[model samples]
Target chain A: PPYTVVYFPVRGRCAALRMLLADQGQSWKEEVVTVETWQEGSLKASCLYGQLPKFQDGDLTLYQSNTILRHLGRTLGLYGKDQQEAALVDMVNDGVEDLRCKYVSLIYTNYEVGKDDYVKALPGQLKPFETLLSQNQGGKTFIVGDQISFADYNLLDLLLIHEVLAPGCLDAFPLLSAYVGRLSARPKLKAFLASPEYVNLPINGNGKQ
Target chain B: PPYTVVYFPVRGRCAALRMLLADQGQSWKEEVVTVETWQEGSLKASCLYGQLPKFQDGDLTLYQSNTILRHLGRTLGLYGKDQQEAALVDMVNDGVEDLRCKYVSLIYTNYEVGKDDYVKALPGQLKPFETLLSQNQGGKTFIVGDQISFADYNLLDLLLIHEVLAPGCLDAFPLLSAYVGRLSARPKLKAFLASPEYVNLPINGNGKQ
Candidate 1:
């Protein structure tokens, strides 16, 4: 494979980038780091920022999950059609990252005690994404412009994981509910989501969520 | 002052964009919101992501600090020289953001209990930036490339805040110490840093660092 994804053996942050690659029909190899490997400290030392989902495109190695997504999006012509739309695309991705950060903290640090409050507050947190949907094409199309951008993939994965974390979390937001449904139903994405490859891996390393 | 930055009185997330505009000698007006104003709920409700640091350029409005930085970086020729450099730039900024997110969580939500643990682990979180500086011009230049990119301002602010949170945090990393000194010496940025506008504002809301 020309592209390599080096990450923990969990969905965690790389789930969206993996979806983008699969949806785009790009081939990549996963170099999964077991919890044992992460604890051994050698590969963690090699990792920039001591985090995973580091991507390799040929000889060029990149860290940070969103950076890899944006790079792939830019190279694959999935960023947006123009400058403004590109900015919008980035806006959506940034928002997704922000919410995801909170989600991760709650999962790793406070999930057992915090899950109820987290889920109770999640709808408010997710409303902005639904608002973004309503602004564009009356929630009929992709997240940013009329076409799919890398943000759509990220947002899709965000919504999916949230559903797992809090069942029917999107029920109040008709647009986000439909948005997830529509995006997840796409042929390649649907297959990948159901595949043993995705199902068997824990959503996170610590096995909380 | 055609560009308007609508944010809280604190410098928290807006520091980088302010530095970017100031360092570039770009004029922008600040629409500072007091806690009372924020609590009133109109502006926050109007905001797309329900947060401050909302930006307006001409008729277009944008949210997300990184989105604003990248947009301004793009318009001001501060992104990078090419696509590869741009990806690397985003990579650096994303790493800064990842750390910043953790920093914010600690300060706002868990500072009383989490500060000691956070400070103890600060060096590992910060070494990547130093390694980046080492790789590029041996601590004499920008974070990503020769010219100052948007990520430099973000990373510089990230380093500055960490140093505040844990004094002498960079003593172990000579490259980062010098890199901070070098970036801080830019004339316009120096002036901006010294101004009452920057000095009077707290590094964050709630009176924490």
Candidate 2:
């Protein structure tokens, strides 16, 4: 394999990049860090930022899930074609990231207490992505441009997880509903999403969503 | 000004990019939004992500502070020298962002309750950057490579603000202390940092910090 992913058994932060790799038909090895191993402290201490989902690309070792995505985007030509598109791609990714941060906080720290308010606010949280997709070729193409960027993979994963957290969350926005359907229909990605490797993994570590 | 920054009066998200523009000798206009104006709801609704710190470079309008930093970085040749270095730059920025998120949460949401614990764990959070600087040219140069990148500006701002939050936070890490001193001494950046426009602004929107 040309790539290696070191993370826990959960989908968590690695899911989007893994989806990108699988959809792109790239081969990679997974180094699943068991909770027991993580509790040991050696690997955690060795991690640069003291976090999981460390990645390796040939000789390069990288941490931070978004950095890994951008790295793969750059190397694999999944970033936009030009400078402006690249900025737009970054903007889209940042928006996705902000919402994802909120989602993660709810899941990990305050799920029992915050889930109701979070779900109540889900439409507002999700509207920006729908608006973005609607603006770009009527949501017919990828997130930033006609070509698929790394952000698309990330945004797709975010939307997927949100749907699981709040069933039919996308129903309020027709564009987003269609988007999930269209992006999930990609042959390689469809297969990857269906495979036990991806399907069986919990979306988060704490067993929430 | 060839660039326009639309953000709240506080330096919450735009500080680093503004520092980048100043350090790089680029001219930009600030379109500050008053709290009353933001409460009007129109502008908030009009914003793509429903957040401030919107930016415009000539005809290209952008949102998200990091995206703006990256746009300026890309257009101004501050990203990195090549693909690999670019990845490293992204890595550094992501690490900085993770810590910034924690800092923001502390300031806005958990300041009274979480201040002591956050300060206690501050050294561990700050250690990664010190280690990164050690690995890169003995911390004599920029965060990522020989030339200053956008992440350098962001990291510098993070350090400066942290120093304000927990006075002398950088004292434990010699390299970080020196890195802050080195980056802050750049002539134009020094002027910007010392200017009323920069110094008078709050580091965050909330009154806490």
Candidate 3:
């Protein structure tokens, strides 16, 4: 394989990038770090950011999930067709990240107390993406442009996990509902989404969603 | 002016990008949104992410602070010299962002209780950047490569604010200490740092730090 991902066994932050790679027909290896291994401290000490989802493309090592996504996006022509579009892609990804941060906090730190409120506010949080889709060709295509950018994968994974967490969440927004269906129908991505590797893994480390 | 920044009156998230623009000899307009205006809700609703720090370059409007940093980085040739360096640049920025997120949480939400623990863990949080600087050219030039990248500006601002938050926070990290002094001395940035626009503005909202 030309790529290697070093991360905890849970999908966590790597799910989006993994989906990106699978959908793009790229091959990569997984170097899973069990909790016991992580507790040993040596590997954690070696990590630049002391976090998982460390990625390597050949000899070049990288940390941070979005960095890896952008790297692959740049190399694989998934960033955008032009500079302006690329900026829009980044904007979308950053928005996704903001909500993802909140979701992660709710899941791991305050799931018992926060889930109800989180679900209540889900529509307001998700409306921006739906608005984005509505503005772009009336939701006929991908998030930013006609082609799928790296942000789409991240958004897809976010929406997927949210759906699991709050069933029938996307039903209110026709664009998002159609979008989830449209993107999931892509043959390779469909296969990858249904694969045992992705299916068996937990969405988060705490087994929340 | 070719650019305009719409954000709260506080320095907040726009400080680094503002510093970058100053250092790069770029002039831009600031459309300050007072707390009263934000409370009105119309402008906030119009904002894509329903947040401040909306940026405009010519006709292109953007939201998300990092996205705007990167847009300026791309347009002004400050991203990196090559794709590999760009990836490294993104890695450094993401690391900076991880710490920044924590800093924001501490400042806005739990300053009274979280201050001591946040400051206690500060060194561990800062060491990765010090390590990054050490690995690249012995801390001679920039974070990723010899040329300054957008991440440098963001990282520089992070260090500066932390110093204000916890005086002498960077004293132990020689590379980082030197880096602060070095980056701060740039003629344009130095002037901007001392000017009323930056000096008069508070570092964050809520009167914490």
Best by lDDT: 3
Worst 10 residues of 2 chain A by lDDT: A125-134
Model 3 has a DockQ score of 0.88
Cα lDDT for residue A48, model 1? 83
Candidates by lDDT, descending order: 3, 2, 1
Model 1's A-chain: what TM-score?
Answer: 0.97
Clashes of 1: 0
Which one wins by DockQ: 1 or 3? 3
Give fnat of each prediction, in order.
Answer: 0.66, 0.92, 0.78
Maximum-DockQ candidate: 2
Candidate 3: segments with Cα more than 4 A from true spot:
none
Question: Candidate 3, residues B1-209: lDDT per residue as tens digits?
Answer: 39999998898899999999999999999999988999999999999989989999998999999999998899899998989999999999998899999999999889999999999999999999899989989998989888888999999999999999999999889999998889999999999999999999989988889
TM-score of chain A of each: 0.97, 0.98, 0.99
Off by over 4 Å in 1: none
Return the lDDT, model 2, position A132.
Answer: 87
Encode model 2's per-residue lDDT on A1-209: one tens digit a residue.
87999999999899999999999999999999998999999999999998988999998999999999999999999999999999999999999889999999899889999999999999998898888888899999888889999999999999999999999888898998898899899999999999999989999988898
Q: Positional deviation of A139 in candidate 2, in angstroms? A: 1.1
For each candidate in turn, the interface RMSD (Å) is 0.9, 0.7, 0.5
